[PDB]
């Protein structure tokens, strides 16, 4: 297990670590998070008590370095930093643990939720969507725009998701206009899977990352990307039968984890009704359809 | 965006534009089968592509062979329409290509947009005008060329005959839409009105009779009366 120490908590803040969250009071003696499961990416996220504007956070993998969080009073946020002195990091972690000033990552043993949401998410792929090459961890916030959102504005601070546009020359072969617009299989299998993503695992990784950024930061462009990536599969007549099987599992756990009170802002009625009841794959998502019908029947 | 009565003068400015009406592309008769089922039989159709400023009509005749062995014909018909309009634009010299294409039915927007991706500067727009272009097949010379076709064919007409020598495009378009609305509402009476007086004939190179300015006022009034008469019959007014 690994640890992210906090130098201090000078402002009152709700801190998230993956799907968990806790409140820290202003100047409370909080010095970090311990027992973080090795083997997954993680996200540590923040919402200030005195200004719920800008949810922000950091994607990281404890296998890639030793990271700590320190408040910057000039920029007014909690920043992630990499500790390059290992001996210092060990002493700082041990002292904070001995004084019991850390919260424990509260993982239940039966509970596979975080694996199920991040199965295909890799740090190296995150670092290509979020470009800041001098850090091993990646900052995301509520207001960052996507590359596609910007084509329709500072490119350094953008989410470089793969652009998906159903009415684009990329999606539509000349001479196959009707075919390719009504059946997205060309665009899914040749352009996206064989061409850009190289395999279904990378495609699902980006889909999962987009969902998590929408849920944890309320990032609107990430929500658009998540729905586009679902719709592209669902609107394709030809998809590897094992590929739809994994899609159903991925979506099931996303819908299961979504806060009930955020469903009105995180779920696109059009896309979901089309995917579950009208699309080529309307019968291929039994687990997702069952949870959607029992948890959010209003949307449908 | 969408085209309506507020920006109606825009139709007669100097930006080239075309209306596209697909309502006569896929045409069928419906009949009982020997077994008592029902079957359709397609008949020849046409795309109605019209420049409202000049009157030039690009009538693409859709021969029934294009449907042979095809499924979901009503859907295919929109995409064939879009394919043919796209091909027409590509066939025109650059300086004759339209800046806007206005479709009479919103179901044509995505098919035409997808076929015209290579032309990002041509705007594809719907309209809130109810345009009676479905009645084009009530113009006898148009209907005859469509029904006699034995293969796909493009035929060019000026749907305003020689009117622009004497009236503006705005007026010519209004006259056309009134004539087509009347033919749509009561075809027999409309044709009766147009041909009642044998001394006024249709030139061989025209679609409509050779009315003087005064006779056109009389005709236009009789067409309005027809439309009003039929409205009263319909609603018991
Ligand atoms: C002192 C810089 C603070 C730190 N470093 N590593 N963990 N905590």
In three-state form (DSSP H/G/I as H, E/B as E, the rest C), the secondary structure along chain B is: CCECCCCHHHHHCCCCEEEEECCCCCEEEEEECCCCCEEEEEECEEEEEECCCCCEEEEEEECHHHHCCCCCHHHHHHHHHHHHHHHHHHHCCHHHCCCEEEECCHHHHHHHHHHCCCCCCCEEECECCCCCHHHHHHCHHHHHHHHHCCCCEEEEEECCCCHHHCCCHHHHHHHHHHHHHHHHHCHHHHHHHHHCCCCCCCCCCCCCCCCCHHHHHHHHHHHHHHHHHHHHHHHCC
In three-state form (DSSP H/G/I as H, E/B as E, the rest C), the secondary structure along B152-187 is: CEEEEEECCCCHHHCCCHHHHHHHHHHHHHHHHHCH
**B109–A contact, CB cutoff 8 A:** no
Resolution stated for this PDB structure, in Å: 1.5
Domains of chain B: 9-163 (3.30.420.230), 164-237 (1.20.80.40)
Helix ranges, B65-152 (H) = 73-91, 109-115, 140-148
The count of CB pairs under 8 A between chains A and B is: 23
| Contacts with A, B 187-206, CB within 8 Å | none
Owner of token pair 């793969």 = A162
- CA dist B52 → B12, B133, B135 (Å): 7, 12, 16
Helix (H, G, I), strand (E, B) or coil at A9: coil
Distance CA B150, CA A105 (A): 77
Q: Within 10 Å of residue B45's Cβ, how many Cβ atoms?
A: 26
Distance CA A22, CA A13 (A): 9
With contact defined as beta carbons under 8 Å apart, do B99 and B15 qualify? yes
**B107–A contact, CB cutoff 8 A:** no
Looking at residue A282, which CATH number applies to its domain?
A: 1.25.40.550
Q: Which domain holds residue A190?
A: 116-299
Please tell me the total number of residues recorded for chain A in this structure: 300
Q: Running DSSP on this structure, what letter comes out for residue A72?
A: E
Nearest Cβ partner for B79 among A169, A174, A178: A178
To test the ligand 1 pocket, which listed residue (A9, A44, A92, A93) has its Cβ within 8 A of the most ligand atoms? A92
The alpha-carbon radius of gyration of chain B (Å, integer) is 19
Q: Running DSSP on this structure, what letter comes out for residue A145?
A: P
Q: Do B117 and A178 touch (CB under 8 A)?
A: no
Distance CA A286, CA A245 (A): 9
What is the β-pairing status of strands A32-36 and A103-104?
parallel
**B111–A contact, CB cutoff 8 A:** yes
**B79–A contact, CB cutoff 8 A:** yes
Q: Is the CB of A5 under 6 A from ligand 1?
A: yes
């Amino acid at each position: 297990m690994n640890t992210v120490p906090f130098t201090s908590a000078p402002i009152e803040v709700t801190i998230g670590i993956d799907q968990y969250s806790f409140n820290v009071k202003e100047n409370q003696p909080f010095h970090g998070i311990k027992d973080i499961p090795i083997g997954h990416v993680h996200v540590i996220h923040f919402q200030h008590a005195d200004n719920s504007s800008m949810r922000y956070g950091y994607w990281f993998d404890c296998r890639m370095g030793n990271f700590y969080i320190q408040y910057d009073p000039k920029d007014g946020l909690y920043k992630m930093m990499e500790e390059r002195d290992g001996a210092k990091f060990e002493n700082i972690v041990h002292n904070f643990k001995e004084r019991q000033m850390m919260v424990s990552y509260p993982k239940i043993d039966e509970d596979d939720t975080w694996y199920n949401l991040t199965e295909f998410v890799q740090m190296d792929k995150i670092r290509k969507i979020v470009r800041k090459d001098e850090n091993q961890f990646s900052y995301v916030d509520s207001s960052m725009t996507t590359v596609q959102e910007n084509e329709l504005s500072d490119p350094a601070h953008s989410l470089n998701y793969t652009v998906i546009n159903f009415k684009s020359r990329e999606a539509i072969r000349p001479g196959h206009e009707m075919e390719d617009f009504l059946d997205k299989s060309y665009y899914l299998n040749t352009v996206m899977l064989q061409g850009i993503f190289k395999n279904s695992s990378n495609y699902f990784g980006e889909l999962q990352f987009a969902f998590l950024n929408a849920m944890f930061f309320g990032n609107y462009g990430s929500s658009l990307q998540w729905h586009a990536m679902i719709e592209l599969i669902c609107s394709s007549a030809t998809v590897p039968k094992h590929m739809l099987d994994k899609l159903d599992e991925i979506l099931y756990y996303q819908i299961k984890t979504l806060p009930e009170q955020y469903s009105d802002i995180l779920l696109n009625e059009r896309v979901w009704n089309i995917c579950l009841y009208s699309s080529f794959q309307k019968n291929s998502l039994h687990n997702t359809e069952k949870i959607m019908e029992n948890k959010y029947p209003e949307l449908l | 965006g969408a085209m309506n009565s507020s920006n109606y003068a825009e139709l007669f400015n100097n930006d080239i534009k075309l209306f596209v009406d697909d309502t006569n592309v896929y045409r069928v008769t419906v009949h009982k089968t020997f077994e008592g089922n029902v079957a359709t039989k397609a008949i020849n159709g046409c795309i109605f592509t019209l420049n409202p400023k000049t009157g030039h009509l690009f009538l693409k005749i859709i021969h029934t062979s294009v449907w042979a062995g095809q499924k979901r014909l009503s859907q295919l018909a929109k995409w064939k329409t879009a394919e043919e309009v796209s091909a027409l634009v590509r066939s025109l010299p650059k300086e004759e290509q339209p800046k806007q294409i206005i479709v009479t039915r919103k179901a044509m927007l995505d098919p035409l947009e997808v076929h015209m991706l290579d032309f990002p500067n041509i705007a594809i727009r719907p309209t809130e005008l109810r345009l009676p272009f479905s009645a084009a097949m009530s113009i006898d010379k148009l209907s005859d060329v469509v029904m006699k076709a034995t293969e796909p064919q493009m035929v060019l007409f000026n749907i305003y005959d020689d009117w622009l020598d004497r009236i503006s495009s705005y007026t010519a378009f209004s006259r056309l839409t009134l004539l087509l609305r009347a033919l749509k509402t009561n075809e027999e009476s409309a044709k009766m009105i147009l041909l009642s007086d044998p001394t006024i004939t249709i030139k061989s190179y025209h679609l409509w009779p050779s009315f003087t300015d005064e006779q056109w006022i009389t005709i236009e009034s009789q067409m309005r009366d027809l439309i009003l008469t039929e409205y009263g019959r319909k609603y018991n007014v």
